[PDB]
Amino acid sequence: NDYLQRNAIREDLESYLREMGDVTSSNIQNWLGGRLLLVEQTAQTLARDHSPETVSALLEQPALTSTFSFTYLGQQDGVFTMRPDSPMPAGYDPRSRPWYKDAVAAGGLTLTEPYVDAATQELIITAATPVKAAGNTLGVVGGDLSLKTLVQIINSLDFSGMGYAFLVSGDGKILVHPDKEQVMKTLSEVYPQNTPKIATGFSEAELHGHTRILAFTPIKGLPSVTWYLALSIDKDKAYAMLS
């Protein structure tokens, strides 16, 4: 019976994809979490000493400079200190920036979606948290992460060559993707006819002439964002490999 045999293969494949999605989501959760905690650790150290000499020395520590492209403190009065050095664009105010507002609105450590960096005019992600001292908010510490770095973490596993992983918001906005052309596009723009639904377990759709299976796994431990790890699998390839 071809129907029972088809369902037998599909259930085995979905079981495997569920397993790959869980571990990859765990992996990016732990990776982002360490970056978040490093930013949190930096803020609480600054909360008890934020003199210019100390701010500079702390941001230059190699645990920070080797982890983030840049680490910085934007203060409540608008003053901005960033390491490593970078030329500054005219009219910059850290308080108007997405990372600063997101941290303040979150009331704690959070991650931005990709936004246009003020200096490089390129997309960047930022781990950010307020600096709190006796209820006062003195500012926000941010740590910048390249989207390429996140693509590499979620694609550490090759998924037996069946496909690839990307990140998507609960709103359907593609945040990081191996194809740079799909970054910040929505699932509806990428799949206009039969759009995959995040809530549904496994969706089938057509991309570039081939049927693909999509599966979305929530990423836990990310305060104030609802992001999913998405697997995009070549359907014909997966069914053939699993006989």
Ligand code: MET
């Ligand atoms: C001064 S630009 C670099 C800091 C941060 N990524 C921003 O765009 O605001």
